[PDB]
Amino acid sequence: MLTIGQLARIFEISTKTLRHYDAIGLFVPARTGSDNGYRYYQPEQIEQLSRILALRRLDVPLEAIDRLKRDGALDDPQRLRHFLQRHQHTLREEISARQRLLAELDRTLATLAHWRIRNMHARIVERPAFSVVGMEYFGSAPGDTIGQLWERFIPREHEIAGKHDPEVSYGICAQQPNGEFHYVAGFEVQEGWPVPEGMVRFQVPAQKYAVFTHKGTAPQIAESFQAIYSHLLAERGLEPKAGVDFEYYDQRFRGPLDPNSQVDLYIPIY
Amino acid sequence: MLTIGQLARIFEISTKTLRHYDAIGLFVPARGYRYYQPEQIEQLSRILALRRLDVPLEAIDRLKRDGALDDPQRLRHFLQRHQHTLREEISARQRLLAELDRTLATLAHWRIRNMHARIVERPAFSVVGMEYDTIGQLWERFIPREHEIAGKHDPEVSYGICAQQPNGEFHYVAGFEVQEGWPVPEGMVRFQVPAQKYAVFTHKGTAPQIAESFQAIYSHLLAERGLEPKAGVDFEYYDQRFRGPLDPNSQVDLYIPIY
Amino acid sequence: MLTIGQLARIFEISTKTLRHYDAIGLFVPARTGSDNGYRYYQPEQIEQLSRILALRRLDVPLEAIDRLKRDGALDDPQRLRHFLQRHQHTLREEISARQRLLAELDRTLATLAHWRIRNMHARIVERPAFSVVGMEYFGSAPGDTIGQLWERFIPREHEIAGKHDPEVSYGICAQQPNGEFHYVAGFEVQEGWPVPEGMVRFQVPAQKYAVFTHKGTAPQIAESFQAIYSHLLAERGLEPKAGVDFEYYDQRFRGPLDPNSQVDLYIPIY
Amino acid sequence: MLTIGQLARIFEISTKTLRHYDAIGLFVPARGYRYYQPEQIEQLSRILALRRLDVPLEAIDRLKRDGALDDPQRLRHFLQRHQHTLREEISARQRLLAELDRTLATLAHWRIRNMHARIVERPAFSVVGMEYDTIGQLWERFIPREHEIAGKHDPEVSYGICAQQPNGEFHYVAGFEVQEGWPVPEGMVRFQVPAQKYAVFTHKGTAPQIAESFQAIYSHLLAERGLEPKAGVDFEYYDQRFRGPLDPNSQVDLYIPIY
């Protein structure tokens, strides 16, 4: 024979959560304090109660519990199991609707993408050869990428002297003679200044450009490269010249992972 | 130029779902006839896959020319602020489902524990039915043939008879206890069940589960009551409390021979 | 004390599946028939075995089982639970990879769609008014659609007399004066023949058409209607005229749900 | 005009993954020097999302100009012949997971059943520690302060003390059994545990589970051994067998006062 205190100890509840139940008539003790309040619980009530405080863990309304125990389904192992299979069935169908509504979210996650990437503004721009000074990337260097280079660069943003435009930053995509991906983040510089250490100097040659205004993120760049080289050029009517392409970050760029930013894409054309 | 029905013929839209939006301001013909325009329809296709996830008619109404009615950039992270919401709305269910899958744990024992053994003596008797890879079909085929057996003693009571052949081999017979001397239909057979004293356990539930009660009976249930299992002719016993091999709310008396 | 027969009875196995185990040394009886083969099992072996024939239900190799019981993890409730949580963890991560590879299947399920629907051939066609005879649909009739009308029509395909072309079938999309969706499946007929019962007669007026060659299914039609009215017209450079549009089924149509079929889409233009 | 590296710079492709395809025939420059072309790249983008689901290099090789290398119609039903395959490859796991979730059922009882009570008498003793919404943090804060307590009798043994206040209220103290007379650090307190005869149950597992053993002990475990529960000072007992409040492979002696 047990008390409200040790019962709350083995169920980890407030002793008034039981008084909460005691007054409801939901979990009444097997004995009354008919005078000075000696309230005593029987050790069989433990599982009669343990089922309640595991049905509550299913968000079953505490009032929905009591109506089961008035019809008797709460002290019946057969009737309780039936209800619990129904509530089980409703849960997985709540999952089913939502599992089928995210297959429907990733199917519009490629329909949002293909509206901009088609409805994309472009203009033709020609430029003479210029000089970009900064640090470089290697498509084979273990443990590095575009987010990593622009991470360790921007602290050294001030070092470049002779900047041609402080608000304009370049991300160049050329190669080594082995076709390796030679990336350089840097600034257009006036031609007569010291190259810092350990920074490099890349000469972008004179090229004719198709300038596409990206709207999105830096990981959204590689796939917008695809549409341009794969299909958007022949659409627009122009031809890919082999040379040096680069992204063009501007005042209108407000973060690598901010989708409301923009990036200009300079691809060589004829 | 598109007319009010022509805005409806494109897809599965009612003629009033538009004037539904007119008084609101969610979408209005540009200019008592009313007019319609070319990419005024992208304004309505995005809404669809948004209403195909039940965005409120008022949620959109701000979401319109606040931005982004038109910016396809804010609605890409927005949509993953809703792939976020939904996939956690799912994950919530999983632990609920998982913890139910484990609340379904204690179910077996509150039943098995509350499974008492009644001791029953049955004089020898004879049952005719079908004899034997799966005992499931053995019932599937026999239940329609069930009115070919004459002289039934109680037609509601079928017997799932498991004989203990000495090899041992599985002998199983499903039939009805019948007065002797009646004829046996071809493809049926008359099994004679010897007189035995049984331990009778009422199993509550489902035909593939009853193996559970069997292991419970033979591991510890018989021991707890002092009874000694006896190799012989056990049988499953069915009556009005049997409502299918898959209904968790039906009862099957298991008849276990003892000494 | 039990035997191989009743043990197989309570586990629903072949009696040689136990002999299979008996020879392996995996489930040896607690006693030998040291002479005439009296093989006897103890009732405690039931759960010692019940764990095996529930681990087999997890496709755990029967040889992987035995090596657990040589190291002792099979008769230990603590060590078995640890292994079972690891195998649990691997299962959900098998789910995780595949649950994440179908969000990746429904994301390309809109990228496959937007290649054709952009790379879509079209030509301009002008036609005088003709007559189509068949049965009609109603966008408000309870329990009906395009699959249902073409279902109950094709059996009555022979009844139409005066056919202009037996291989060509039309699916018309006009209204009632209330903007309701008035669909008619039918055939182009020579103008002087009896209208069957209960079939109707729709006069398609003289119109200028943008003819788009659908590739897909009948449910793939409504969304190809979208791209045309929504964006593909201004792309192509022409204007939507209000009137009567229809699908055009041909020799090159090989089934409503056969994706390798084609359908010509006639939309009124200027 | 695109060069061999230029076919690689577009995406995350090695300079040899192409010549990988050259000898095969899966993709070859039209005419070490070799040449490249404009929608020869769609021929390679579809492959990606096909290799992003690991289609065999030889499966594709037929799938190419057999059809459909180019027909975007066969590869839409094909892809759902693989949404089919994968979503059943998942569903298979679920029943395995679900039936494991229910194989995890019988786990509790094979443990609880095999939980014996040792009867232990402890002369009165004193423990100093921290006193008390959640007893989880009560340990989280105290474990670093654990070397401020001087005069420890055994430093590996911590005590989770639950006093039975008459109201009743939750009194809980987490500390170390210490020789009396040493000083008590501020924000700690010295609890005196009376002399009691205990029933000691070794619990195998995890701090949020131990409520399980508590209900098992107080519902039927104490009865089965004739012992009478006694309101008093119970305490959880930790030692080298305790490896965290979430590790299912650690042991916690529960100390239950009896008559």
Residue numbers in the entry:
A (entry chain D), C (entry chain B): 1 to 270
B (entry chain A), D (entry chain C): 1 to 31, 37 to 137, 144 to 270
What did the study's authors say about this model?
BrlR, a member of the MerR family of multidrug efflux pump activators, consists of a structurally conserved N-terminal DNA-binding domain and a C-terminal GyrI-like binding domain. BrlR mediates the antibiotic resistance of P. aeruginosa by activating the expression of multidrug efflux pumps and repressing PhoPQ activation. The monomer can be divided into three domains: the N-terminal DNA-binding domain (residues 1–75), which adopts a winged helix-turn-helix fold; the long central α-helical linker (residues 76–119), which connects two terminal domains; and the C-terminal multidrug-binding domain (residues 120–270). Our most striking finding is that BrlR is not only a pyocyanin receptor but it is also a dual receptor that is responsive to both c-di-GMP and pyocyanin.
Subsequently, the structure of apo-BrlR is determined by molecular replacement (MR) using a protein monomer of BrlR–c-di-GMP complex as the search model. The final model of apo-BrlR is refined to 3.1 Å resolution and contains four BrlR molecules in the asymmetric unit. Two full-length monomers (A and D) can be traced, and the other two (B and C) have the same interruptions (residues 32–36 and residues 138–143). Four BrlR subunits assemble into a stable homotetramer which is composed of two cross-stacked dimers (AD, BC). The head-to-tail interaction of BrlR in a tetramer occurs only between two adjacent dimers (AC vs. BD). Helix α1 and the subsequent turn of the HTH motif occupy the groove of another BrlR-C domain in the BrlR tetramer, with helix α3 interacting with helix α7′ of the BrlR-C domain. The unusual interface of BrlR tetramer causes most of its DNA-binding region blocked by the multidrug-binding domains from their tetrameric partners, thus indicating a lower DNA-binding ability. The blocked HTH motif and the long distance between two recognition helices hinder BrlR to approach and bind DNA, thus resulting in a very low DNA-binding capability of BrlR.
